[PDB]
Design an enzyme around this catalytic site. Sequence first.
Site, PDB file in Angstrom:
ATOM      1  N   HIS B  40      61.052  67.379  -7.288  1.00  0.00           N
ATOM      2  CA  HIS B  40      61.689  66.297  -6.547  1.00  0.00           C
ATOM      3  C   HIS B  40      61.880  65.033  -7.381  1.00  0.00           C
ATOM      4  O   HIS B  40      62.398  64.029  -6.863  1.00  0.00           O
ATOM      5  CB  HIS B  40      60.927  66.004  -5.246  1.00  0.00           C
ATOM      6  CG  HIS B  40      59.593  65.327  -5.415  1.00  0.00           C
ATOM      7  ND1 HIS B  40      58.404  65.946  -5.087  1.00  0.00           N
ATOM      8  CD2 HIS B  40      59.264  64.067  -5.794  1.00  0.00           C
ATOM      9  CE1 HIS B  40      57.399  65.107  -5.286  1.00  0.00           C
ATOM     10  NE2 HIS B  40      57.893  63.959  -5.713  1.00  0.00           N
ATOM     11  N   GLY B 142      53.657  57.203  -6.770  1.00  0.00           N
ATOM     12  CA  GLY B 142      53.701  57.497  -8.183  1.00  0.00           C
ATOM     13  C   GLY B 142      52.690  58.519  -8.652  1.00  0.00           C
ATOM     14  O   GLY B 142      52.667  58.840  -9.847  1.00  0.00           O
ATOM     15  N   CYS B 144      52.560  61.719  -7.906  1.00  0.00           N
ATOM     16  CA  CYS B 144      53.034  63.093  -7.992  1.00  0.00           C
ATOM     17  C   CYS B 144      52.971  63.592  -9.428  1.00  0.00           C
ATOM     18  O   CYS B 144      53.141  62.835 -10.384  1.00  0.00           O
ATOM     19  CB  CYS B 144      54.455  63.201  -7.448  1.00  0.00           C
ATOM     20  SG  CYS B 144      54.500  63.191  -5.672  1.00  0.00           S
TER      21      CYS B 144
HETATM   22  C1  LIG Z   1      54.158  60.314   2.489  1.00  0.00           C
HETATM   23  C2  LIG Z   1      55.699  60.470   2.663  1.00  0.00           C
HETATM   24  C3  LIG Z   1      56.102  60.085   4.113  1.00  0.00           C
HETATM   25  C4  LIG Z   1      56.405  59.513   1.672  1.00  0.00           C
HETATM   26  C5  LIG Z   1      56.152  61.924   2.408  1.00  0.00           C
HETATM   27  N1  LIG Z   1      55.431  62.841   3.246  1.00  0.00           N
HETATM   28  C6  LIG Z   1      56.176  63.822   4.041  1.00  0.00           C
HETATM   29  O1  LIG Z   1      57.368  63.880   4.016  1.00  0.00           O
HETATM   30  C7  LIG Z   1      55.369  64.791   4.910  1.00  0.00           C
HETATM   31  F1  LIG Z   1      54.857  64.143   6.002  1.00  0.00           F
HETATM   32  F2  LIG Z   1      56.185  65.812   5.297  1.00  0.00           F
HETATM   33  F3  LIG Z   1      54.354  65.273   4.133  1.00  0.00           F
HETATM   34  C8  LIG Z   1      55.906  62.364   0.961  1.00  0.00           C
HETATM   35  O2  LIG Z   1      54.808  62.559   0.527  1.00  0.00           O
HETATM   36  N2  LIG Z   1      57.060  62.597   0.086  1.00  0.00           N
HETATM   37  C9  LIG Z   1      58.437  62.421   0.407  1.00  0.00           C
HETATM   38  C10 LIG Z   1      59.138  63.357  -0.551  1.00  0.00           C
HETATM   39  C11 LIG Z   1      58.128  63.726  -1.602  1.00  0.00           C
HETATM   40  C12 LIG Z   1      56.873  62.980  -1.255  1.00  0.00           C
HETATM   41  C13 LIG Z   1      56.220  61.909  -2.128  1.00  0.00           C
HETATM   42  O3  LIG Z   1      56.626  60.805  -2.023  1.00  0.00           O
HETATM   43  N3  LIG Z   1      55.108  62.246  -3.028  1.00  0.00           N
HETATM   44  C14 LIG Z   1      54.535  61.173  -3.804  1.00  0.00           C
HETATM   45  C15 LIG Z   1      54.776  61.496  -5.261  1.00  0.00           C
HETATM   46  N4  LIG Z   1      54.833  60.554  -6.096  1.00  0.00           N
HETATM   47  C16 LIG Z   1      53.019  61.130  -3.483  1.00  0.00           C
HETATM   48  C17 LIG Z   1      52.736  60.797  -1.985  1.00  0.00           C
HETATM   49  C18 LIG Z   1      53.433  59.259  -1.687  1.00  0.00           C
HETATM   50  C19 LIG Z   1      52.630  58.600  -0.928  1.00  0.00           C
HETATM   51  N5  LIG Z   1      51.192  59.267  -1.046  1.00  0.00           N
HETATM   52  C20 LIG Z   1      51.444  60.696  -1.758  1.00  0.00           C
HETATM   53  O4  LIG Z   1      50.585  61.486  -2.008  1.00  0.00           O
HETATM   54  C21 LIG Z   1      59.014  64.775  -1.018  1.00  0.00           C
HETATM   55  C22 LIG Z   1      58.329  65.732  -0.007  1.00  0.00           C
HETATM   56  C23 LIG Z   1      60.074  65.304  -1.988  1.00  0.00           C
END
Ligand SMILES: CC(C)(C)[C@H](NC(=O)C(F)(F)F)C(=O)N1C[C@H]2[C@@H]([C@H]1C(=O)N[C@H](C=N)C[C@@H]1CCNC1=O)C2(C)C
Lengths: 298, 299
Positions: B40, B142, B144
């Site tokens: 992503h 950040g 991920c």
């Molecule tokens: C929490 C949020 C509502 C934003 C969302 N969650 C859901 O969509 C769910 F509810 F379906 F899980 C979510 O995590 N993402 C949205 C999107 C990726 C991801 C993401 O931003 N990953 C971050 C990587 N840097 C790490 C996260 C950020 C905050 N704390 C973490 O660990 C993808 C699934 C492609």
Amino acid sequence: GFRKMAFPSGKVEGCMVQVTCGTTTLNGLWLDDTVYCPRHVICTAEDMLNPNYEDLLIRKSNHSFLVQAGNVQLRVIGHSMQNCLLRLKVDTSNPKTPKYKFVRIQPGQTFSVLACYNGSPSGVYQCAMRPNHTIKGSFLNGSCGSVGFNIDYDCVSFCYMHHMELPTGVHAGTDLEGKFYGPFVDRQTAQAAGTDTTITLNVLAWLYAAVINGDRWFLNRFTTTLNDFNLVAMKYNYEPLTQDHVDILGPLSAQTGIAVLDMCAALKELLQNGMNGRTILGSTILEDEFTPFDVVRQ
Amino acid sequence: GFRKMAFPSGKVEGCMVQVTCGTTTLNGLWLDDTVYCPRHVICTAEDMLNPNYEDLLIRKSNHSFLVQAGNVQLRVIGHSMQNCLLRLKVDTSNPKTPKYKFVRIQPGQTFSVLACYNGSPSGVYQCAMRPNHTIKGSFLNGSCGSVGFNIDYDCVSFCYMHHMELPTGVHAGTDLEGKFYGPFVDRQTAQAAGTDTTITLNVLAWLYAAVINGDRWFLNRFTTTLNDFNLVAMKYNYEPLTQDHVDILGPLSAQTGIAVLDMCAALKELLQNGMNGRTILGSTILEDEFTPFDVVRQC
Ligand SMILES: CC(C)(C)[C@H](NC(=O)C(F)(F)F)C(=O)N1C[C@H]2[C@@H]([C@H]1C(=O)N[C@H](C=N)C[C@@H]1CCNC1=O)C2(C)C
Ligand SMILES: CC(C)(C)[C@H](NC(=O)C(F)(F)F)C(=O)N1C[C@H]2[C@@H]([C@H]1C(=O)N[C@H](C=N)C[C@@H]1CCNC1=O)C2(C)C
């Protein structure tokens, strides 16, 4: 989403070596061309009752120190004692030496520990210098010489080297100048710490951590004076709160919108009424090994 | 003296890099001439419900990927998609690459997480893979591409790459082949963790640790069969014990002289009668992320 976190240990892992005298082996810290290790490496079951370290060191040569940095053996070209450490001079300078400082930490402050065995790192965990100058560590046989440290930017601040376990199961050691924290001596004899107390400043910081993370069940509409709270602190073996401590909690106070003396009223209620089967940030005890700085960083 | 301890993180620290696609930055894992990172990274509010990753990938050139190992930029030479990961071929082989393998961690087992931001490690902590295939982590924006791992002798076993946070505050991700743990997808859509259950093998390990520590108020003289304990455990959302779990607890039962099924009868009573305000190892809640290996190694 809030837990004990240790600093990454790689900068310290590259400094760990094994130091052997006869049958006694422990860990040393290799910085530039110096290896620091606890001085009782030169002892053999005269650990007890009468380690005269000056007498025992004069009888040693450079050749009696076997220092191993992984596969390679470094040759000792000199040695001196400083307080309860040895400083071993070696012919090779550690190419992995990080930017570093030696600091003496204050009770209530936290650090990461890299636990080592036979010169080889095996685990990393966070802990704190207790008000009675012990640490509640996890140290087994062969762990002497393991270090505690903090990392600021690229700089490793070494603050602890491990020496001994007290009969209560807590640990004692020195700074990297070899001076013990607390009333202890490196002799195998029964030694007690002073009675420990709870680090009030850290509990308050962790209560702010909880509010920041959505746990507000313990707040209340009351508030309290400093001396009024301190009277309650003394009854429950908490250390007194200082206006400087209130000043340290300023940034956490601002970010949450809860005055320090309001959080103290909440803490006063938790000490007096217990927690009634509820949790705070997943814990059923009031956590006192997170500093304000640790909470902000997380 | 029992506490959660992480593996030394240096071997993984030397593999952490930053990967940037336009406005979105996250971490990657640089082993030899491959950089692994969540796919992503190529998204841009295409994250919403429906990214078509094959479509977004075909529309990206190697030069659109900015990969930085600390000070130096690495040139992306090729790329492919493996499940929910990208594999970026770079022109430089990581000289700090440790001996490694890629493993699929099983529910109940633990690992260390090196939380990273912008390719720089910021903290290390230990985690359990929950039965509902989430982890109770500590991840901010950040994070991920941060990885979880175990270290056996000199070999790093990578088992987790972080992708997302679910609404209950727990976290989801993949192994290092890009296959998600659990039924989650890397799409910003309505997703929820299943009902968690308690890792019974680890609760039993914790009670053994408490006996080793001199705390044994909870022991009794009832007996139970494995089947009758498993029936009660499932009533309380505890995992049933397997054949292998009973074997795994052998060393601790021998060490304490408390038969596995006797500790099961101790736990069964705790489940049915609660603690009544008594504490075990200082807590009124039974810990379930401390394995029989952790107890054994810390004694
Ligand atoms: C929490 C949020 C509502 C934003 C969302 N969650 C859901 O969509 C769910 F509810 F379906 F899980 C979510 O995590 N993402 C949205 C999107 C990726 C991801 C993401 O931003 N990953 C971050 C990587 N840097 C790490 C996260 C950020 C905050 N704390 C973490 O660990 C993808 C699934 C492609
Ligand atoms: C615990 C023991 C009863 C053995 C003793 N303690 C006391 O004599 C006291 F009562 F004074 F504390 C003690 O620790 N030592 C005896 C001796 C050193 C030291 C020692 O063995 N250090 C170990 C270094 N590798 C780490 C320890 C071992 C087990 N777990 C640790 O942390 C010196 C004081 C010279």
